[PDB]
Amino acid sequence: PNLFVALYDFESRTENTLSITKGEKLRVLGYNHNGEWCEAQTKNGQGWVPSNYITPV
């Protein structure tokens, strides 16, 4: 899977994270080492989101 959708709203509170809204589509570009964060791209740009806040489409 490469195309994902947000399960829950997540609000970025730092420079490298990416805010997402439930239902919003994102492209996932990888996981970090411990797996708790994914690198995502949406129409708002690119950054990290919780890996358990998204799911494949």
Residue numbers in the entry: 63 to 119
From the publication, what sentences describe this entry?
The Src homology 3 (SH3) domain is a ∼60-residue modular domain that consists of two antiparallel β-sheets orthogonally packed to form a single hydrophobic core. This domain is present in many proteins and regulates critical cellular pathways by recognizing polyproline-rich motifs (PRMs; Kurochkina & Guha, 2013). Three-dimensional domain swapping (3D-DS) is a mechanism by which some proteins can oligomerize by exchanging identical domains or structural elements between monomers. In previous work, the 3D-DS of the c-Src SH3 domain has been characterized and its dependence on experimental conditions has been described. This work explores the role of the hinge-loop composition by interchanging residues in the RT and n-Src loops between two SH3 domains: one being the c-Src SH3 domain, where 3D-DS has been described, and the other being the Abl SH3 domain, where 3D-DS has not been described to date.
However, the interchange of one or two loops within the Abl SH3 domain produces a noticeable reduction in its stability but does not promote the formation of 3D domain-swapped oligomers. Conversely, replacing the RT and n-Src loop residues in the Abl_Src chimeras with those from the c-Src SH3 domain results in destabilization under identical denaturing conditions. In this way, the ΔG values are the same for the WT and Abl_Src-RT, but the Abl_Src-nSrc and Abl_Src-2 chimeras show a noticeable loss of stability. Similar to the results from chemical denaturation, these data point to lower stability in those chimeras where the n-Src loop was exchanged, whereas the RT loop has a minimal effect on stability. Although the conformation is slightly different in the RT loop, the hydrogen bonds are conserved. In the n-Src loop, there are significant differences between the WT protein and Abl_Src-nSrc, but also with the Abl_Src-RT and Abl_Src-2 chimeras. However, Src_Abl-nSrc shows an ordered distal loop in most of the molecules in the asymmetric unit and this chimera does not form the intertwined dimer. The same behaviour can be observed in the Abl_Src chimeras, where the distal loop shows low B factors. Indeed, even though the Abl_Src chimeras are less stable, this reduction in stability does not allow formation of the intertwined dimer.
